[PDB]
Amino acid sequence: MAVTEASLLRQCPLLLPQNRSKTVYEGFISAQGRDFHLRIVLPEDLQLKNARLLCSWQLRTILSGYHRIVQQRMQHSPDLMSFMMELKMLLEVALKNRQELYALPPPPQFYSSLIEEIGTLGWDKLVYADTCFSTIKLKAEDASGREHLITLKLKAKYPAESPDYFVDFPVPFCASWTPQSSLISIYSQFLAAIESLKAFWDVMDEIDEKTWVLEPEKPPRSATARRIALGNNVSINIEVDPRHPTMLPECFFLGADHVVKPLGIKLSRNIHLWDPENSVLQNLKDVLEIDFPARAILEKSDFTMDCGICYAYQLDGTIPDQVCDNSQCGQPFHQICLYEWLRGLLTSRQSFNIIFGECPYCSKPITLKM
Amino acid sequence: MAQDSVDLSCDYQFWMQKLSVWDQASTLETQQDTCLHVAQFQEFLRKMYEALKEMDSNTVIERFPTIGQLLAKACWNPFILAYDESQKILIWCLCCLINKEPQNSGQSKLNSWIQGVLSHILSALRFDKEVALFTQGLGYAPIDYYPGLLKNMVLSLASELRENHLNGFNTQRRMAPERVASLSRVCVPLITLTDVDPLVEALLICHGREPQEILQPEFFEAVNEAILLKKISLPMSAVVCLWLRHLPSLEKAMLHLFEKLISSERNCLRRIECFIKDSSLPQAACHPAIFRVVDEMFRCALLETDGALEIIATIQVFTQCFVEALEKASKQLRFALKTYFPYTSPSLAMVLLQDPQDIPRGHWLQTLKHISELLREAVEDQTHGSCGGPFESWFLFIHFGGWAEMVAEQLLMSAAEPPTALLWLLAFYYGPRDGRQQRAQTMVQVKAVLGHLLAMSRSSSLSAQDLQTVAGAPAQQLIRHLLLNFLLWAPGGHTIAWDVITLMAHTAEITHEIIGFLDQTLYRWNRLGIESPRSEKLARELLKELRTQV
Ligand SMILES: [Zn+2]
Ligand SMILES: [Zn+2]
């Protein structure tokens, strides 16, 4: 309703006015099928510019990082009615965010069905299950003999709504979810995607084996990019279409302008002799009229010796100088980039010509002396 | 030669009732609305100045009632006094209202008050007391330190902003958002006064950490206007940030290209190329977002006209500046072409990127024959896992000038047994969305025309009516352009080109269309360094004489 005599009943059923002069309300407030104790003292008139509001310590843990919010809302909100709307809305927010603490599953469907269904698959399949039982991650095999993993993140109702599927491989995966579908169903869909992309995988595996793939290190199955090295201090980066893998990619070369120019010319001249009945390597070798190095150096292949903020060597004369005092990062930077960076952080403090604060990559103490 | 008084006498009462609103622009609203209406205020002042200049003062009482109050209100408003020449014009208005020999008491009082207000604009100490006292002490006139004073005032605020910028989420003095908006409002009226331009560029780089914009778009549009009319020349980093925070500025500037290819310099592609390279579009189109927005406005124009040769030309040029800008500023960390060109095979692009500067004249037929194959794969075998359709693979084919144009000029060189692939290619270019039925018809029409033309070339220099026969529908522009290629290419031309031109020039549209053809061809040859000097001089001559006829 308009007025907060019926509208306040309808929108706060469990707030029982104790006093005749409706100054103390007491009892429960509702949110996400959960009721909370709440005791809300007004002054002698209906003015929230001055009011008390006490809570259960339950509710106060759940209003943590909102205290100023609520105090401002008491001062800024015209009526009690709207105040309660704002307060519920804010509870709404608070719980859904802290979703890790709050999940009472209906066992009779859940924990039994999930067991039945993992039995339906086979027990070699499942590889990880979380003790909140929210996450699972499953395994599948190629005709090749490659493992590909699938994460599922599951809700209070598994069989009702979709399970959130998180997947590696580079085309967007489609799972037709019904209430009738189950783990075996989405698993068969996932196998279908595997056996479909078989060619693209063979291309990637063939490359990684018979060449010095250099930049993506331990490649995922999602990566379309392969910065291959060849000769010395020249490289080719090659971005591939999965749907037509053997077909021609967008490509270009890094290194010496005097070394690369001839290869570009030669490529532009032989590029009509690309053929999607050969392999990518068997096309590249005879198009560019070359053989590749199979790991000319496997230990000191390359460590990216660039700024790790701006990713340039030679920013206005300056060199990658300032490093991390850490064995696991070692990452060089620039004087300019690291100063601009650390000034900005809240963790940074500046002494006379010194700036203390966190390495961008590893969050360990790093010192900059201007 | 009708009204003279009336429109100005109305707009007078409008502006006087507006000046009284503003009243020294010490507040937000008075400033924003002044910022807007000032320019029209200036034009009003031009018409007013003409009127007061042609006539003489103290004699006439036309608008003399409250002209005084208008010029008071004007001058004590500093946002007025800051704009291009509004000051200069106010000076002139006052110099019109002066008198040489004042006669009644009123005229002397007037003229004194006139010197007063000029002295208030130019030479008044409406500034901090101690600095006045100190300088007067050192025996300095405002004139000799104002400049350095201004310079220091600016470098201060620019510095301040750069530390605001670098302290992003730090427990340290946060430049007041209100004050930044304040400065921005003051950048507008004196953008073309060189002693702010560091401030500006500091504003555009130094965005800071807000979800909300802080600057008011009257700032962005003042700046945009001034970039395009070349009153500003900032560095390019300034203007990428400008585009990348105010979309209607980046609209406003790609539309200010369109005025250039429509009105001013129809088919002077040198002039168009130089405007694109001086504008910073290429470098700003290295950011994939601004590429996508710009090519949307290009797509909207490809449709309004159904494949206008003039917009095809501007694309070809723009793309060539862009591609050279990509290569240049893309050593490490560049976005993959399915990012700029998402609605095609990256395969096809990677072919079409290879320029003909780097291939021999003889191997271009091979290149086109490869393109025909992959386009036919994309269009005819229009299945899942492809382009969305034929139109998209065409809008790609446009963005490469060179390849679409060279087909006709290569057909004439291989007119004896023409390759079916080239006939596919050219038919596709002049007509997508036909059915195989309509493409085969077009191809065989062109094949018969190749027969007639090769007979005519291997014959002597013949009439123009023999060509008018085959000229005499859906495939007209194809045949026209191929025919012009024939004229320029064969040495049987240079004699009977005029003879066909005169007849083919039915309308002015055909004339302009062929002119665009010829400008494109000259630009194309002079780039690629491929030439018979006969054809070059002939095209130049024809183009020169036909641009007069229109
Ligand atoms: Zn750097
Ligand atoms: Zn580190």
Number of helices of chain A: 10
* Shape annotation of chain B: elongated
Give me the secondary-structure category of chain A.
alpha+beta
How large is the share of residues in beta strands of chain B?
under 5%
Percent in helix of chain B: 55-70%
Main sheet: strands, sense, barrel of chain A: 4 strands, antiparallel
N- to C-terminal distance of chain B? 32 Å
What's the helix-strand series of chain A? HEEEEHHHHEEEEHHEEEHHHEEE
Task: Report the principal-axis shape of chain A.
Answer: flat
Helicity of chain A, in percent? 25-40%
Strand order of the largest sheet of chain A: 1-2-3-4
Catalytic activity (chain A): S-ubiquitinyl-[E2 ubiquitin-conjugating enzyme]-L-cysteine + [acceptor protein]-L-lysine = [E2 ubiquitin-conjugating enzyme]-L-cysteine + N(6)-ubiquitinyl-[acceptor protein]-L-lysine
Binding site for Zn(2+) 2 (chain A): 324, 329, 359, 362
Pathway (chain A): Protein modification; protein ubiquitination
Zinc finger (RING-type) (chain A): 307-363
Structural account:
Chain A: It catalyses: S-ubiquitinyl-[E2 ubiquitin-conjugating enzyme]-L-cysteine + [acceptor protein]-L-lysine = [E2 ubiquitin-conjugating enzyme]-L-cysteine + N(6)-ubiquitinyl-[acceptor protein]-L-lysine. Chain A: Keywords: Acetylation, Cytoplasm, DNA damage, DNA repair, Fanconi anemia, Metal-binding, Nucleus, Transferase, Ubl conjugation, Ubl conjugation pathway, Zinc, Zinc-finger. Chain A: This is E3 ubiquitin-protein ligase FANCL. Chain A: One of its GO terms (cellular component) is nuclear envelope. This is part of a larger assembly, with chains A (370 residues) and B (550 residues). In chain A, 30% of the residues lie in helices and 18% in strands. Chain A is α+β, with helices and mostly antiparallel strands and 370 residues long. Chain A is flat. Chain B has 550 residues and is mainly α. In chain B, 67% of the residues lie in helices and 0% in strands. Chain B is elongated and about 95 Å long. At the A-B interface, strand 11, helix 8 and helix 10 of A face helix 18 and helix 19 of B. The site of one zinc ion has 8 residues of chain A, from loops.
